[PDB]
Structures are given as C-alpha cells and as structure tokens.
Amino acid sequence: MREYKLVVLGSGGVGKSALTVQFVQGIFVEKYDPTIEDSYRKQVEVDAQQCMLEILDTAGTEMRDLYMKNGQGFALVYSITAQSTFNDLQDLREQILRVKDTDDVPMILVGNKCDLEDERVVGKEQGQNLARQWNNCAFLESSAKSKINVNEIFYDLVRQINR
C-alpha cells in the first residue's frame, strides 16, 4: 500500500476542514473552528489499488514552504461565496511551483460551497478560466455539506501522483 501526502490549502473559512472531515470521517462540520494544523489518515481504493492518504488540513487565517516541500498533491480551495478567497489562490499556486521548482505538480482547483447558489460571487466560468490559466489544471466545484465532488478531489490527486 503506497502512501500519498496530500495538502489542502486556501484562505480562511472556505471549507478546507469541512471537505477533509466529510471525506475522512463522513461528518459535516457545521461549527467554524479555525484550524492551526490537522493531519488525517484514510485508506481508499483508487484504480484497483489500496492507497493510504495522509491529508494535511492547513490554516487559512495563516510552515508553508515545508508543507509544499513535503506534499505530493495539493487541493487549492476557495469559496464560490467569497471573491477574496478566489483571488488569494494565485500566489499559492506560484509558491508551490517555486518550492517544487517545476510546473509538473499534482494539483486541483476547488470551488467549495456550491450548495450555496444564492450566495455565489465567483462564477463557475471564472473558476474554469483560472484552471486553464494554470496549465490546464484539474477543476471541480464541491460541497462539503451536500457531499458533492468531495471524494473526487482526493481521488484525482492520487491519480495525478500516479502518472
């Protein structure tokens, strides 16, 4: 069983912990409790093999260079509800490429809170546009609350690490 070091990055309140906890524990985290640094472990099956995922759930309110050095795959999460969180991701993408010293880094752009259509600020096509800008990066809109595209975030990173 191969181990996969995944890192969930993004600004405060976007749902990094909620996505990670839904994926790992099958629980929706309702209360907002700002993360300092949490790590989770989860065995899953991807492409006919058992994989042990070690998922680092990072602080969004604000060790980062180390996370990027060690990490094999990165989920860059914003909330479709908050423009600033979408804006903040460009610098994180650039930081990862710098630390890795390559464009060839497993990555996925995640527009979370897609159950909140009434509060949407960042259009889906703006998310798609950013992903294309990023060398045709993987992109999903997700909901930790509705269990929409939650597993798919982490499975896609595993597949990317495997190529």
Binding site: M1, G26, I27, E37, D38, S39, Y40, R41, Q43, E45
Partner: protein
C-alpha cells in the same frame, strides 16, 4: 500574532494541533477545551502521554508539556527503561474511568470513530484475547469498514494474503492461526455485505465492531509493565491491565492472558516496599505478587475503578 501549540495524536497516527494559551503551564482540561469536541464527545476521552514502552493517562490538572519535559525523570521513577529512546507524544484516548454502561449508549459518530480506531489498534497489537470465532467476526467487520461491500470478483480468491491479514487480525495470530481462517473470514464478510438487515452506515459498522469488543476482558484497559516470578522462580515480564471490569495479566512477549479477575472476586495490597503489589484471588485460596515501580499507580486505579462499581 505569535502563539504556542502542541499536536494531540490519535492511535491511527492522525493529529490535531491545539493552541497552548498558557504555554507549558497549560492543563489537560484546557487542551481538551481547545479540541474540536462537543461537551458530548469530550466526556469519553482525555489526554494520555505515551512513548514506545509507557502510556499513562493524565489528570485534568496535569500540565502535559511539563510531563514531556520531565519524561526521563518519570521513566526513572516508574520503570527501568532506556530514556533516550522514549520520546513521548500526547494522545487523545478513551478515559479509563468511562463506565461500560455509558459507552454502550453512545450514538455520536465522532465519539464512535475515535473509540473504534483505538479498539482496532489494541486488537491488531494483540492486547485483546478472545476465541477464534470472535476474532474472525472482528476481522470480517474490518473488511467491510475498510474495503466496503464484498464483491466476488475482487475478494473470493487471492485477496486475503499475509499483508492484508495484518490489518484485520492480531499480530500474535498472523503466523500460526490466521492463515487457516481466511475462508471463515471471507464467509462472514460476504454475509455482512449481502445482509440488508446489517446497516452499512460507517458509524453503525464501527459500533458493531465496538459491541464485539466490549465483552473482551481487557477492553478499555490501561496497561502497566511489571514482572512475576514463577511459583527457579523464573521471571515472566507482564503487562498489568486495569479497566472498569477488573485486573488482567498478559505475558509481555506472547500477550497470552495469564489471569483475569473481576472486581469483587479479588483483593489487593500495595507492598510495603512500594516496588510491588499482592493480589488475593477468591474461591481459590490463590495469591501472587506483581513487581513493578508502577505498583502505586496500579493500586490507586484499582481502588478508583472498584469504587465506581454498583
């Protein structure tokens, strides 16, 4: 801007970082407040300090970072261990005082998964003695939980190899017993998956696993280390297990259950030397002495857990 923090681990190797608002003077109770746990989830667990060869439950008033600092001295007081090789970490684990009657009514998914992870850890390490049938049932539940539904295409043949078995049976059974259980394990696994009466909700399956662990004699035990002399008094290193049911001795090397005594059926006496305690077993006229510098801790816990029992 600046703050101090500590990682609180669980038995699966996961951790949560918690803010230390009073530095190394922060207490266990304060750290428990700092977790992501409801007043629901919190009462079942507390902070333990654990290295490779000693794990101790801390009191709510202890300052865990000071226990980490003082670990060499603690090891010298309570054991004869190599201090250099013991580097302790702080863990969230089941409170040894948690009554089984309370645990049996727990419905909270997070509490269940935390208890489940810890129980699985104990099972795989060999600290749960049980008949083959029980271990097979536990293994089948682990397959459902970890791998999902049985599929003939995936599981019927060439699936339960020695690597796979390591994750679902005790390490003590891997070489001589487990290889002969594969068909029995696969049968129960298939039966779980195809039985619509069996809920496949994760927390339901995890609770079923716990339900099968609750009658195991050493369930929820705090373990201490010691020695007994055979009744040419050859030394046998032992684990002393103390839980809400009573006292349990395991052979340290084999994890074999040497004796299991329920509260009300035995008495104890702290040795006047304080390097041991004596046990007197009833309807038996049989007695034994366990040598350990944790004797004081063992007797205090026995008193507390016996005292809890109605």
């Amino acid at each position: 801007k600046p703050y101090e923090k500590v990682r609180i681990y669980r038995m699966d190797g996961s951790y949560r970082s918690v803010e230390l608002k009073h530095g190394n003077n922060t207490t266990v109770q304060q750290i428990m407040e700092g977790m992501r746990l409801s007043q629901e989830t919190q009462q079942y667990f507390t902070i333990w300090i654990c290295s490779e060869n000693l794990s101790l439950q801390l009191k709510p008033y202890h300052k865990p970072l000071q226990h980490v600092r003082d670990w060499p001295e603690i090891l010298a007081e309570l054991t004869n261990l190599d201090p250099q090789r013991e580097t302790p970490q702080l863990f969230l684990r089941r409170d040894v005082r948690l009554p089984l009657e309370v645990e049996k009514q727990i419905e909270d998914p997070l509490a269940i998964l935390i208890l489940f992870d810890e129980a699985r850890y104990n099972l795989l390490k060999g600290f749960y003695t049980a008949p083959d049938a029980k271990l097979i049932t536990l293994a089948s539940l682990l397959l459902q939980i970890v791998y999902g539904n049985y599929e003939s295409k995936k599981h019927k043949q060439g699936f339960l190899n020695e690597e796979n078995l390591k994750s679902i049976v005790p390490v003590t059974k891997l070489k001589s017993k487990a290889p002969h259980w594969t068909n029995r394990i696969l049968h129960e696994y298939k039966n779980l998956s195809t039985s619509e009466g069996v809920s496949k909700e994760m927390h339901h399956l995890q609770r079923m696993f716990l339900q099968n662990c609750w009658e195991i004699p050493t369930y929820g035990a705090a373990f201490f280390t010691g020695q007994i002399f055979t009744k040419n008094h050859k030394v046998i290193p032992v684990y002393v297990g103390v839980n809400i049911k009573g006292l349990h001795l395991l052979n340290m090397e084999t994890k074999a259950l040497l004796i299991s005594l329920k509260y009300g059926c035995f008495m104890w006496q702290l040795g006047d030397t304080d390097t041991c305690f004596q046990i007197h077993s009833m309807e038996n006229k049989m007695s034994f002495i366990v040598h350990t510098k944790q004797a004081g801790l063992v007797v205090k816990l026995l008193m507390k857990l016996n005292g809890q029992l109605m």
